[PDB]
């Protein structure tokens, strides 16, 4: 045998070095996210490519990896401060990326301005929410060919009450035209306009994320039974809703950024 046993039983040097060099850089769910990207930035390519952050195939877990090897992991449930049995609608890879990008920003802000632990955990969300680089990425994805800084467009009343009810799922069962389109993305391929709703998970992350490890979960998780509901219903009747929407897009110079007498809450973020 000889050096099979030499070769095999050998401990894995490269592993525990990289694997807990990491713990050094420690001396938190979002904190890691940030750290890890921060770390990844100090490298320069041929090297940067060997750092990856990616959901497990099951979207239950965010994994960190140097070279091939998982270095550290994170449960989404816990990352969003929500319970074990909570269901998450799947994300397309672009949605996954934004998601990840937003967590970094939460990271920065946590580790950069610890003094937002002052009254309002909201003023952390509001920080993230207010940040133009997020705003950009959200628009880039969800309304790819819209200038978020455009002047609003003013309403042109086309709506019946059967209609208004079909659009209630867009805003938690309410109707209100200054605000009815704020979770709605749209793209223009080949002179068609296609619509879809901001992925609940992201909506949650932009709107109701609360850092607390005290116990707000089941409560902060009923909110994922407002967002997944809105989302699902929309989906469940997508063809009809989009017809209406399509009508409205075209009549207001190709937006849903609809203002009504100085009120305009129809932005994405």
Contact residues for 264 (Cβ-Cβ < 8 A; gap 6+): 152, 178, 257, 258
Other Cβ atoms less than 10 A from the Cβ of 162: the count is 7
Closest CA to 202 of 64, 56, 94, 85: 94
Strand 258-259 to 61-66 pairing: unpaired
Structure tokens at 234: 């929309």
Phi, psi of 258 (to 5 degrees): -100, 120
Tokens 């060099």 map to which residue? Answer: 21
Closest CA to 176 of 104, 260, 97: 260
For residues 146 and 120, the answer to whether their CB atoms sit within 8 Å is no
Q: Which residues pair with 193 in a beta bridge?
A: 188
What is the stated resolution of the deposited model, in angstroms?
3.0
Phi, psi of 180 (to 5 degrees): -75, -10
Structure tokens at 136: 């950009």
Determine the Cα–Cα distance for residues 176 and 168; give it in Å rounded to an integer: 9
Contact residues for 226 (Cβ-Cβ < 8 A; gap 6+): 172
Tokens 């039974």 map to which residue? Answer: 225
Assign residue 53 a region: left if phi > 0, alpha if psi is -120 to 50, beta otherwise? beta
Q: How was this structure determined?
A: X-ray
Determine the Cα–Cα distance for residues 230 and 239; give it in Å rounded to an integer: 15
The angle that helices 122-130 and 93-112 make with each other, rounded to 10 degrees, is 120
Neighbour-count burial of 149, counting CB atoms closer than 10 A to its CB (0-12 exposed, 13-18 middle, 19+ buried): exposed
């Amino acid at each position: 045998v000889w050096d099979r046993f030499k070769d095999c039983f050998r401990t894995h040097k490269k592993q525990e070095v990289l694997e807990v060099l990491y713990t050094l850089i420690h001396g938190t769910g979002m904190e890691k996210i940030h750290a890890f990207t921060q770390l990844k930035e100090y490298a320069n390519p041929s090297q940067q490519d060997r750092f990856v952050m990616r959901f497990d195939m099951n979207q239950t877990q965010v994994l960190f990896e140097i070279d091939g090897k998982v270095i550290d992991k994170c449960n989404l449930h816990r990352l969003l401060n929500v319970s074990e049995n909570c269901i998450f609608k799947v994300m397309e890879e672009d949605e996954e990326e934004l998601f990840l990008k937003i967590c970094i920003k939460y990271g920065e802000k946590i580790s950069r301005y610890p003094e937002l632990l002052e009254g309002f955990a909201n003023k952390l969300k509001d920080a993230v929410n207010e940040d133009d680089d997020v705003k950009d990425e959200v628009y880039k994805l969800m309304r790819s060919g819209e200038d978020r800084k455009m002047e609003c467009v003013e309403w042109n009343g086309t709506l019946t009450e059967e209609e208004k009810n079909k659009l209630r799922c867009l805003q938690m069962g309410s109707f209100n035209i200054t605000t009815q389109f704020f979770k709605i993305g749209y793209w223009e391929l080949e002179g068609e306009v296609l619509f879809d709703m901001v992925h609940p998970t992201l909506s949650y992350l932009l709107q109701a994320y609360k850092p607390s490890l005290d116990l707000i979960e089941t409560n902060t998780m009923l909110f994922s039974d407002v967002l997944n509901k809105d989302y699902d219903d929309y989906q469940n009747n997508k063809r009809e809703i989009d017809a209406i929407l399509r009508r409205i897009y075209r009549s207001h110079n190709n937006t849903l950024f609809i203002s009504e007498k100085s009120s305009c809450r129809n932005m994405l973020i």
